[PDB]
Design a protein around this ligand. Structure first.
Ligand code: CA
Ligand code: CA
Ligand code: CA
Ligand code: CA
Ligand code: CA
Lengths: 98, 361, 220, 103, 98, 46
């Protein structure tokens, strides 16, 4: 039994040492980082906290963010675990009626 | 999801008329990023109620009514915004809204654990990104991998080193300048003291980031105001973008003006110079500057006819000079001078267009 | 709960140690043979049978050179044509029978790929292990009749070729002699559907008799 | 979290005009320490209601009106403040508000 | 099985005799106090009640407060277990409208 | 035990490689795709 203290479905040594997600036929596989293969494919090496379920503390796990099992309205540059995902809302006023 | 802003009607300096939470008529179910509620083609929504069941109009007494009709200063503040998170379900894949949880729980957690970077190289628009960085005095926060500045700029803004040099699009990083608040500037000072380096641009792969940092990255070309909006360039830059003339007519000018550049120009000045030298200005008012239209083909169009009573220019002699000058936002005026000056006399104009009369048509 | 679903999906998703391409290719082939009962595998090496797992084109092999280019035109278990150098299994009719397959990941994915390998194994039994003491042979000859004359042509659209279906007369007890080829292709088909676990119920469905026999056959 | 102060409008020495609990227009979702609601750049909020559904203005009679326009002494007391705790969850790390518990 | 009467995930003898929290690679480890190592690192020796889940009686455990699994808006000087964490709210009145 | 990661009651290899639904007497059967039978019936490969 491999440990995952952060309980985010992804073990701790992989989050420390680097990992990636890769499809093979139609199936996503959580590989640890190997520079001989994944670098040639252009896959991005990922590191995150072994003790944070969400390393950016946003309400989305590390695994959901790297897997894609997320609200798709999240911007693609926010799909990295060290990138936070949050709304910024402000209201403008176009017209007055008295 | 389920957006309910809490806003405030304010008169004057700080005379608050009212504070209103958004009611069920004012609910927004979805507000995806880079979007509006309602959409831009549709008309904005109406807020006119104070009750929780929306049965009382927003009331103003007499003195405030007089002051409003005198001063016309009625501002709107956004105090706080209610809204929920929808989370993924591992059961059926369906992302479902928890009505219990809200972003109120989450946003200060993000703010106290990340470094914030604001950048405006994408069409002069302030883009904010928060990146998780280590607070050394917090043991759980130290469990994160280390973040250099260059890696952060690469993953956050889509930067690259296509030739070993950090670039945003085709622009070098060295054409951008850095700004820090006092704590972050002090920490960067300490890190550069330890690294024994002077140029920050050389050591971007070594800058250790921390929580609660604030990094403003702007373009070195343009000039900025208090609110860090792009207000105006140097003369060398403004001229460089106008070296592409498409259509020369006595009705207007068609140019391929750069989209970034044009956004810091308030308007244009059109005059005619004698062969000995006179200054006869067609659009000789402070509010006769707006002639520059933007066609949907990506080419900015100047129009002489708009402020010449529907008629083209008047070429008394085809050996004169037709001058067209531009006005930056930092140089423009919006009211006449002290006495009565409704003219283009005291304006810092910039030479963009100067061609003869036989070279137009 | 949501974490139990997460443990299900990850055990499927996350891998740790890499066997490497050469080991995975070999292992995938081994897993196929584990579905085959060793009942017939031992009888295959008993008659001098060799199992090979080559890479690339099968035609480029040492134990199989350029033998008779006509047989490099093959139909699958569906009866659709195929060029042997693009295929991934072939069995050899000779005094030294030998089976050779390509190696792929897809033998733990493509049930279609597996189904044609159990098909070729079905041939091997039906001739190289069965043609010897086939006679009186009536035990399988009678169940093949029931597929022919019955409602629901599905079973004969599954197992018979485009010839045995259109043969108007009932099946004579001489056809197996003249056409030991065709009657053993059918046995090769119904074998493969039965052995492949997911197409098994399909055999019980569309051809209940052929299943009913092949179920009885192996276990006793 | 979910700050609802109970305040009091008072004339004179101790002549209390009214005691008002903060309503849903006056709710503050977050009040982090060393902070203001609303922020210092923005204008302060408006309290003008007595009903639980905010349909009655805060009323003053005649003598109090005269005394207010004479003396200009109108003070504001903060009697008690309602507000909740958000606690850490060991399940997913998410700090969640218990609406039941309060400070 | 080590006892923790206060049920705060941290045993009783450590809360009595002194302890600390230290990361090693990316992982927080709850050590008892050793002056040879943790004093050189500048780690603060911690003592708390063996029978109080929250020794300061604030709605945060001793373990959450030393670990960091807390609302981060808590001030850093309140991250010590003997330091209470509580809001102080009072209302000011800027303007009247009659 | 055949896997179905999507937990939708239908295994993963069938969703990848093609399948169909067919009634036999009065009962719906989830078959994998076979072109010899289901194509003649007009069943749509899924
Ligand atoms: Ca993990
Ligand atoms: Ca993690
Ligand atoms: Ca304890
Ligand atoms: Ca304790
Ligand atoms: Ca499925």
């Amino acid at each position: 039994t491999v440990p995952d203290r952060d309980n985010d479905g992804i073990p701790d040594s992989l989050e420390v040492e680097g990992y990636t997600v890769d499809v093979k036929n139609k199936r996503t596989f959580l590989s640890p980082w190997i520079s001989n293969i994944h670098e040639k494919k252009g896959l991005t090496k990922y590191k995150s906290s072994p003790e944070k379920w969400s390393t950016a503390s946003d309400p989305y796990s590390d695994f959901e963010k790297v897997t894609g099992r997320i609200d798709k309205n999240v911007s693609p540059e926010a799909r990295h675990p060290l990138v936070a995902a949050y709304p910024i809302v402000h209201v403008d006023m176009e017209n007055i009626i008295l | 999801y389920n957006v309910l802003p809490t806003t405030s009607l304010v008169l004057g300096k700080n005379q608050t008329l009212a504070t209103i939470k958004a009611k069920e008529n004012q609910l927004s179910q979805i507000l995806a990023p880079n979007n509006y509620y309602p959409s831009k083609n549709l008309a904005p929504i109406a807020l006119n109620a104070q009750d929780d069941f929306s049965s009382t109009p927003i009331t103003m007494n007499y003195n405030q009514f007089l002051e409003l009709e005198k001063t016309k200063q009625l501002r709107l503040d956004t105090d706080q915004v209610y809204g929920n998170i929808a989370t993924y379900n591992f059961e059926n894949g369906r992302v479902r809204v928890d009505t219990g949880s809200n972003w109120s729980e989450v946003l200060p957690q993000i703010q106290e654990t990340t470094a914030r970077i604001i950048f405006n190289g994408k069409d002069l628009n302030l883009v904010e990104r928060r990146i998780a960085a280590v607070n050394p005095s917090d043991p759980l926060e130290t469990t994160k991998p280390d973040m250099t500045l260059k890696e952060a700029l690469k993953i956050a803004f889509g930067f690259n080193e296509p030739n070993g040099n950090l670039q945003y699009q085709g622009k070098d990083i060295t054409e951008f300048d850095f700004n820090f608040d006092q704590q972050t500037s002090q920490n960067i000072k300490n890190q550069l003291a330890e690294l024994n380096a002077t140029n920050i641009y050389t050591v971007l792969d070594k800058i250790k980031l921390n929580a609660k940092m604030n990094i403003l990255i702007r373009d070195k070309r343009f000039h900025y105001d208090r609110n860090n909006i792009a207000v105006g360039a140097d003369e060398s830059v403004v001229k460089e973008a106008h070296r592409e003339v498409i259509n020369s007519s006595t009705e207007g000018l068609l140019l391929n003006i750069d989209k970034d550049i044009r956004k810091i120009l308030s308007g244009y000045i059109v005059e005619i110079e004698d062969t000995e030298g006179l200054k006869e200005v067609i659009n000789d008012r402070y509010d006769m500057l707006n002639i520059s239209s933007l066609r949907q083909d990506g080419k900015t169009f100047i129009d002489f006819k708009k402020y010449n009573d529907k008629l083209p220019l008047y070429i008394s002699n085809p050996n004169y000079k037709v001058n067209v000058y531009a006005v930056t936002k930092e140089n423009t005026i919006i009211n006449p001078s002290e006495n009565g000056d409704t003219s283009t006399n005291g304006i810092k104009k910039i030479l963009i267009f100067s061609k003869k009369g036989y070279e137009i048509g | 709960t949501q974490e139990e679903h997460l443990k299900e999906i990850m055990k499927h998703i996350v891998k740790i140690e890499v066997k490497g391409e050469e080991a995975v290719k070999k292992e995938a082939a081994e897993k196929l043979l584990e579905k085959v009962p060793s009942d017939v595998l031992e009888m295959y090496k008993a008659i001098g049978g060799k199992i090979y797992i080559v890479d690339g084109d099968i035609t480029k092999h040492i134990s199989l050179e350029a033998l008779s280019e006509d047989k490099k035109k093959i139909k699958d278990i569906y009866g659709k044509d195929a060029l042997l150098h693009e295929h991934y299994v072939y069995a050899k009719e000779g005094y030294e029978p030998v089976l050779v397959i390509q190696s792929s990941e897809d033998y733990v994915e493509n049930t279609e790929k597996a189904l044609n390998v159990y098909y070729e194994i079905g041939k091997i039994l039906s001739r190289d292990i069965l043609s010897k003491i086939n006679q009186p042979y009536q035990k399988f000859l009678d169940v093949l009749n029931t597929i022919k004359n019955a409602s629901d042509s599905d079973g004969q659209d599954l197992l018979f070729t485009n010839q045995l279906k259109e043969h108007p007369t009932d099946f004579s007890v001489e056809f197996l002699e003249q056409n030991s080829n065709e009657v053993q292709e059918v046995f090769a088909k119904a074998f493969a559907y039965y052995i492949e676990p997911q197409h098994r119920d399909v055999l019980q469905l569309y051809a209940p008799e052929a299943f009913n026999y092949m179920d009885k056959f192996n276990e006793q």
